[PDB]
Each structure stands twice: as structure tokens, then as C-alpha cells.
Design a binder for this molecule. Structure first.
Ligand code: TIK
Length: 298
């Protein structure tokens, strides 16, 4: 299907120390939010005590509460970039459109923290949210969610949830990274020129992983896990022109065949990252998909 016209324009108009690279990523996110301002939303900043230290969070409170579980959201950025501010545009809209309380998580970034530290942190935050939920008037079971590297974390938390005695009602994976071992067709076909590139992915792995062997660890590559039975209901959103497309869709098929209630949606014409790029109407369409999916959980 042709590249979406606005996407095509965005790519055509695209033109460092670690600190500078992080600031650049932050500046781009700011520019997009200036172009398409987020909805106003009540928020509260907090800090959760994890097994690897304090992790800042931001709780988003909907104008009108309509969903009975808290959402715990883990931002993307290759494990190296991003924060609660870079993903505010997405989270504010998830909050208000779903009518859900959302916990956005500022997990520890690489290379300063290495695999599997943020996985541990993300579990600890999920556990905290489950314990708080009754006092917010909610069910203790949580929904985990994330984009890209954040979708990785969400998928891994979900695979660990039973073992960690963590009640999870659903998982929302937005163009996740799931298999660091295998090349897929999309990974070859869209390797360069679609925002998320091959070289960047390599560099992200070099920052996050301890050694090259970690690629086969199931907490890095959750698509490798042989037993997906009994995992939480899954919404897997992919972009057509994304190197990570094929691994995301393959995992959705594997979940489905393992009896996990699964919705798999490819947004045609789109690229990696589109759900934090509000210049594209498909971002809000995908958020509507989330709301529709979550309507069916209870
Ligand atoms: C070396 O750290 C890890 O990879 C790890 C961490 C906790 C539990 C298990 C493991 C493991 O699989 O290898 C020891």
C-alpha cells in the first residue's frame, strides 16, 4: 500500500554526544507537540521505590473515569532516549480517550543502566500500581502498554507476570521490538530511510545489552519464548513500513495460536513511531483502537 502522504512529507523534510542526542530526541518531541498540542489533563508526579532504585512516575487522571483498570505505560526510545515528557502527547490522549488512569514510567536508561535493569524496574512499578489500584477505586489487575522499546518492556513484563504474582488484564504493544536474534523480511526491506534504521538499532543494542549473547535472553527477545499460553489479552499495533513490523505481527499470530485473545492491527502506509507523532491522524485512530479493545476486556 503506498506510503501515507503526510508520512512521505515528514520523511522528506528530515535533515553527537549521548547528552546531545538525548536532547535532540527531546526537542523533536517538543516540536511535534507544538504542532499538535495535547489535550489538557490532570497529572500528579511521584516516585516508586524499585529494586534498582527510585523511579519517577506521572499519574494521569481522566476527566471522566470509564475504564476499571490502571494502565502502566512504558515509553520507547531504544532503551536510551525518551522520558515522561517525550511521551506526554500519547499518554495524555490515552488517558482522556480511554478514560483511564495511566501511570507513565521514567525507567532507567542505557547505557548508564544495562539490561535487565529496566525490566526489573517496570515489574516493580506494575506491582505498585496493582497494590494502589483499589484506593483509586479500580480493579487490582493492570494493563501494561508501551511503544517500541516500551512495547518490548510491556511484552516482557506480561511474560513474567504470573511468575511475579502480578495481575495483568491486558498488554498493549505499539510497534514493539520483540526478537533481537532473527532477521525478518521487514527488517531487510525497510532497513533504512523510515526513521528507525538498522545502524541505530545496532547502536541501541550496544548501549542496552551487556554482551552480544544477551540477544537470545528471553527478557530481551520475548518472541523466543516457546510457551505463550495463558498470557494477557493482547493488542498488537504495527506500522506497514517499519523494520520491526514482521516480528510484531508474528508474535501476534503466535499469541493467537496459543489461545490468547489477540487483536492485530497493521496501519497501512505508516512508519515506526507514528503513535507519538500527532501530525498523523493515524495516531488518534490507533488510540481509538486502544479504547475499543479495552472496552472488550470486562
Ligand atoms: C546475569 O543476569 C541475568 O541474565 C539473569 C538475571 C536474573 C535471573 C536470571 C538471569 C539469567 O538468566 O542469567 C543469570
Amino acid at each position: 500500500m503506498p506510503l501515507d502522504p503526510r508520512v512521505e512529507q515528514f520523511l522528506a523534510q528530515m535533515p553527537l554526544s549521548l547528552a546531545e542526542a538525548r536532547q535532540q530526541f527531546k526537542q523533536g518531541a517538543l516540536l511535534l507537540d507544538q504542532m499538535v498540542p495535547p489535550p489538557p489533563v490532570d497529572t500528579e508526579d511521584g516516585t516508586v521505590v524499585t529494586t534498582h532504585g527510585p523511579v519517577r512516575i506521572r499519574r494521569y487522571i481522566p476527566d471522566r473515569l470509564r475504564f476499571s483498570h490502571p494502565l502502566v505505560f512504558y515509553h520507547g526510545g531504544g532503551f536510551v532516549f525518551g522520558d515522561i515528557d517525550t511521551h506526554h502527547g500519547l499518554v495524555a490522549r490515552l488517558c482522556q480517550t480511554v478514560g483511564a488512569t495511566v501511570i507513565s514510567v521514567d525507567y532507567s536508561l542505557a547505557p548508564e543502566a544495562k539490561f535487565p535493569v529496566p525490566v526489573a524496574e517496570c515489574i516493580d512499578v506494575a506491582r505498585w500500581a496493582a497494590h494502589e489500584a483499589p484506593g483509586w477505586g479500580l480493579k487490582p489487575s493492570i494493563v501494561v502498554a508501551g511503544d517500541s522499546a516500551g512495547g518490548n518492556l510491556a511484552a516482557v513484563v506480561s511474560q513474567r507476570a504470573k511468575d511475579e504474582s502480578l495481575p495483568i488484564a491486558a498488554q498493549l504493544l505499539f510497534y514493539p521490538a520483540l526478537d533481537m536474534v532473527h532477521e525478518t523480511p521487514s527488517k531487510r526491506d525497510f532497513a533504512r530511510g523510515y526513521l528507525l534504521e538498522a545502524d541505530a538499532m545496532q547502536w541501541f543494542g550496544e548501549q542496552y545489552l551487556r554482551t552480544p549473547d544477551d540477544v537470545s535472553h528471553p527478557w530481551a527477545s520475548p518472541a523466543l519464548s516457546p510457551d505463550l499460553t495463558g498470557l494477557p489479552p493482547a493488542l498488537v499495533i504495527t506500522a506497514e513500513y517499519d523494520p520491526l513490523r514482521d516480528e510484531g505481527e508474528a508474535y501476534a499470530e503466535a499469541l493467537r495460536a496459543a489461545g490468547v485473545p489477540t487483536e492485530q492491527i497493521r496501519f497501512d502506509g505508516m512508519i515506526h513511531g507514528f503513535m507519538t507523532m500527532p501530525i498523523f491522524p493515524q495516531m488518534e485512530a490507533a488510540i481509538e483502537a486502544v479504547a475499543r479493545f479495552l472496552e472488550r476486556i470486562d
